[PDB]
Point group: D2
Chain length 308, copies 4
C-alpha cells in the first residue's frame, strides 16, 4: 500500500519525486501539497499542476499551503525551464489549504498509516502539528528531504529547506513523531550520470523527455556557475526511502535545529557523540544504494508509460 502525502515546492527535484511516487507501485499518493520556496507559492503550484498533467496523474488533490515562512522573511521564469504551460490545466487546485487538507486526511484515516514526505520548507507540516496536535501520534512517520549533518549549501553548514523556515523546522524535529532526515550527506550521492541519462533517454516517453528537458535546463544553470560533472537529484531520495528503506543506511541520532547562530542558523545539529541514546525519534540517512535508487526511478518511468 504505502500511503503518503507529498509536501513540496516543485522545481526540478520535486518533479522527479512526484514522478517516482506516482509511478512506483508501492506508493499511494494521497495528496500533493505545496509550500513557498525559492519561487513563490503561486509559481510552485503551477509547476506541480504542470507535472501532474504530464505524468497523467488523476484524483490526487494538489493543495496550496503557506505563502511565507512562519516568522522569517524570504525577503527576495516563464513556464518551467523551456516547457510552456497550457493555457489551462487539466488538474486544478483544491480550495482546502494544504494545512487543513493534511489534517483531514490524517484524521480521516487509520492511525499510523500515512507517511508525510516533505521536500521543501517545513512550514505546512509545522502549522498542521501546531493546529492539530492530534495528528502527531496518528502519522506513521515523517521522512523528509532536508538538512545535512556535515554539509551545507544555502550556507557553509545549512541546507535550503531548513534555513528557509528554521522555526517550522524546529517544530517538526521537536515534535515526537519518528523523523528521518534525508540530507545533503546522502543526496549528494544521487548523481544523474551520463549512463543514467542515457538510460532515461532510452525510455522514450513524453514524461521521460520532459524530465530530461527540465534536467538539462536546470543542470546547465547550475553546472554553469562552476563545474559539476553531474548534478545530483535530492527529493526523490526521500520517496525512495518509503518505497524501500534498504535503499540507504540511516543512523539514529538526536537532531535539533539552530535558531540563533550567526553562522550556524538552520544547521541540523546532530550528536554522533560517545553514549548514543536508547530512545531517539530521530535518524539520519548516510549511504545511498545507487543502482537500486536509479533502478526505482527508471522503473517508475517505464510504468508511467505515455499517459493521455
Amino acid at each position: 500500500a504505502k500511503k503518503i502525502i507529498l509536501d513540496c515546492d516543485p522545481g526540478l527535484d520535486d518533479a522527479v519525486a512526484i514522478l517516482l511516487a506516482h509511478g512506483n507501485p508501492e506508493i499511494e499518493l494521497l495528496a500533493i501539497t505545496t509550500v513557498v520556496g525559492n519561487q513563490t507559492l503561486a509559481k510552485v503550484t503551477r509547476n506541480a499542476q504542470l507535472v501532474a498533467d504530464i505524468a497523467g496523474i488523476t484524483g490526487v488533490p494538489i493543495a496550496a499551503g503557506c505563502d511565507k515562512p512562519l516568522v522569517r522573511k524570504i525577503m527576495t521564469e516563464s513556464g518551467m525551464g523551456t516547457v510552456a504551460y497550457p493555457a489551462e490545466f487539466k488538474n486544478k487546485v483544491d480550495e482546502r489549504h494544504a494545512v487543513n487538507l493534511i489534517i483531514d486526511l490524517v484524521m480521516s484515516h487509520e492511525p499510523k498509516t500515512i507517511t508525510l514526505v516533505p521536500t521543501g520548507g517545513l512550514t505546512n507540516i509545522a502549522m498542521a502539528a501546531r493546529l492539530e496536535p492530534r495528528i502527531v501520534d496518528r502519522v506513521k512517520e515523517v521522512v523528509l528531504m532536508g538538512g545535512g549533518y556535515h554539509e551545507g549549501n544555502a550556507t557553509s553548514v545549512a541546507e535550503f529547506n531548513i534555513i528557509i523556515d528554521p522555526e517550522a523546522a524546529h517544530i517538526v524535529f521537536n515534535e515526537s513523531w519518528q523523523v528521518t532526515m534525508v540530507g545533503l550527506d546522502l543526496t549528494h550521492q544521487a548523481l544523474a550520470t551520463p549512463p543514467i541519462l542515457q538510460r532515461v533517454k532510452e525510455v522514450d516517453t513524453n514524461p521521460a523527455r520532459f524530465m530530461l528537458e527540465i534536467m538539462d535546463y536546470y543542470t546547465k544553470i547550475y553546472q554553469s556557475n562552476r563545474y559539476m560533472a553531474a548534478a545530483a537529484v535530492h527529493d526523490p531520495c526521500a520517496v525512495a526511502y518509503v518505497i524501500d528503506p534498504s535503499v540507504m543506511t540511516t543512523e539514529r541520532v538526536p537532531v535539533d535545529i539552530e535558531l540563533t547562530g550567526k553562522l550556524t542558523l538552520g544547521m541540523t545539529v546532530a550528536d554522533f557523540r560517545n553514549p548514543r541514546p536508547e530512545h531517539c525519534h530521530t535518524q539520519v540517512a548516510v549511504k545511498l544504494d545507487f543502482e537500486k535508487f536509479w533502478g526505482l526511478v527508471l522503473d517508475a518511468l517505464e510504468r508511467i508509460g505515455d499517459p493521455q
Copy 2:
C-alpha cells in the same frame, strides 16, 4: 455596533474584560476564544465557561485554540479561586478551533468591521494570520493588552503575554494591520481602589459578588508576596479602548519584538526617537482616564444586572 472577538486566557483580568465587553452596549462580542496561558488551555477554557454562565452570556461561541506556543516551550487550582464549577456548564465549547473560528467570522463579515482584542499570548492570532493572510486586510484593527515600553513583569523589561510567545508576537506586530498596544505602562494605572471596590460592592448582583470574590482571592495571593495597596486590572483596558478610544492617550511609534536577547527576550521595543515616522501602523497607550475607565466597568455591571 462595535463587533469584536475576545481572545483571552481567563484568570482574574480576562473575566472582568469579558464582563465589561458583554455588559457595555457599544460592544458586540462575536466570540470568546481561548489560548494557553499560565494555566493550561483546558483550565482556562472552563474558566471562560464559568464566567459566561455567571454573566448570563448566550449565543456567543467559546472556542479553544492553541494549547502550546508556536515555537517556545511553556515548560511549567480547583475552580476559579474559591468559586466552584457546576458539574456541567450551560455554555459549551464549539468544535471549531479558535483559529478556524476567527478566520470564518472575519471572512464571513464585511471588511474592516471586526476588531480583534487579544488579552493573552498572541498564538491564535498569529496562527490565523499565517493561515489566512487574507484576514489581515479585512480586520478593522488589533487592540491588545500586552507588552510594556518602559516596564516589565515577567521580567525586568518584558510582559507575560509577550514573553509567552515571542514569535506569535513578532508575527502579529509585523503584520500590517493597525495595532494598539495597551501595555503595563497604561495598565498599571488601572487601580481597583477601596472606593472602587466599595462602588462594586454597592452594585449587589451575583456577577458583582463573583467579581469581588475572584478579585479578593487573586489580590491576596498577589498583594501577599509583597505589598500592593491596590491591585490593577489589565485586560479590561483593551476593551475599554474599543468602547471609547478617548479613555486613554496613545502614541504612534514603531514597536517590534526582541526574539534573541538574553535579558531582553520578548521586550516590546519602542522607538520614541528624534524623527517620528509619517506612516506607522503601531501605537502605544500612555495615560488612563481613571474615572471614565472605572465608570465603564461599573456601568457594565449595572446593566448585566442579575441574569438567570
Copy 3:
C-alpha cells in the same frame, strides 16, 4: 581632593569634561586615557593633546589605549607616555593606596575592561567607577542603546559585571545638562580663550546635531560624570541592578535595569536620574573662570 583617571575619546563633550576636570579644585587628574571612539584612536589622541594645551595642563600623562573594540568591528606641547593606557591605568591603581581613585570613562569601556582582565586586583583597589554611558529608558545609537555601550558591548558587560561600584550617568540624566541661551551668555562673558574655545566647539557641534532637526538646545554629557564626582549631590541616583544585552538583534548594547520591586539590598550598580541644572552649570562655569588664561 579627588583623584580620578578620566578615560575618554575626546570630541565635543570629552573636551569639556576635561576642562571641568582640570579647572575644578577638588579634582586631582592622575591621567587622561584615550580610546577609539567615533574617531580613530590617533585622532582622538591628538584632539586630547590639543585640548590639554588649550587648558594649559601639564604633569598629566596622556596615554592612548585601545584602537578597536574587544570583539566587534567598529565597522564604519603635551606629549603621549609610551605607556598603553591599559598599563598606565594598572600602575596608577597599583601605585597608590586602596580606594583613592575613581575611574571616569567617557568613551567605550574597552581600556577599562582590558585593564580589569589584565590585572584583576584593580577592581577591588579602585574606589568606584563613574561612567557617562547608557540609558535605562532612552537610546541614541538605537531606540534603546547608547553610543558608548554599543561600541563595545563586551567591554561594557565586563565592567558592569565586576564587583566594583559603578555609577551610570546615562542619557536619562545627561539629557538634562542643557546648553541654553542664558548659559551661552555667562560663558561668553568669561573671555578666556578656553571659554571661547568652548562655544566654538559648543556651536560647531551645536548646530550639526541640531541640524538634522531642532535640538532647541544642546546638552553636554561627559561632564556630568565629572560633576557627580565633584559633588554626588549634584544629581539623584537610584540603586538598581544593571546588565548589558549582548545578543538581542533589536536590543544589543542596551543597559538593562531592573526597577521591579522586590529591590535587593546588596546592589553594586546605580543609575543617574535627576540633575540640578543650576549646581551643574555653576561648577562648569567656576572651572572656566578658575583656569584663567593659559599662559
Copy 4:
C-alpha cells in the same frame, strides 16, 4: 631550529606537548605561558612547574596569563616570571625579528587574544599560529564544539579573525593520535623517569576517560600541534575559511569551516586532517630518548 611559545593550560596532553617541545632539537622554546583551563590558573601553573622540573628544563620562563575567560564565566625548581603571560608574550615578539616565532596555544585563546588586542603589531610579526583547538565535523564539549574554543569563544573569535596564519589542529586530526598498546611498549622500554612519568599520567587520565565507557585506546592532542611545527609534513591540511560561532544556542563555540566550493585563493586559515601515525609517534619517542635522565 624553530622558536615557539607554547601557550597552555597543563594537564595530561599539555604535559606531553611540553616534553616533545623541549626534547625535540628543532624546537627552541622561548617560553611556556599559562591560561586558566579545566583547572584554576594557579593549579595549571604549579602543574607546569612540576613538569618543567620533571623534564629538566631551565632558562625557559614560565609565565601565568589570564585566570578567567574574556567575557564568559568559566562557570563550573623553576619559578614564575612576574611577567603576566600577555606582557611576556608581547615583548618576546617585539623583542625578536619578524616572522621567527610561532605561537602554540593548547588551552583557550584568552592570553593570545588579549595580547593581540594590547599590542596589535604582533599579529604581523608573528610567523604563524598553530593551535590544538576545535573540530570541523567533530565535537567533545558538545555535539559540535571543542573544549578549548568554547571555554573562551570571544578570544577564539578574535584569534581566528586576525590576519595572521592560523593552523587549527582540531579533533578531526587529533583523534588519530592514538596511544595504542604497542606504543605503550617502546615508551615503557625507554626507562627514564619522564618516560615513566608519561605512562603514569597516560594511564591515570587514560582510564578515567576510558572509564565512562571504552576508548579502546586514548589519544593525545596537544602534542600534535607541536608535531606539525616540527614537520608540517607530519599531517595533511586543507586551506578553508574558518570562523567562530558566538550566538548559537546549540552551536556556541563551533569552529565553522566552509568547504563549499567555489575555494578562495586568499585564505589565512587552514585545518588539519590526516595524520601520519608513525611519523607522529616516532617524534614523540625520539624526544623522550633525547631528554635522557634529568640530572
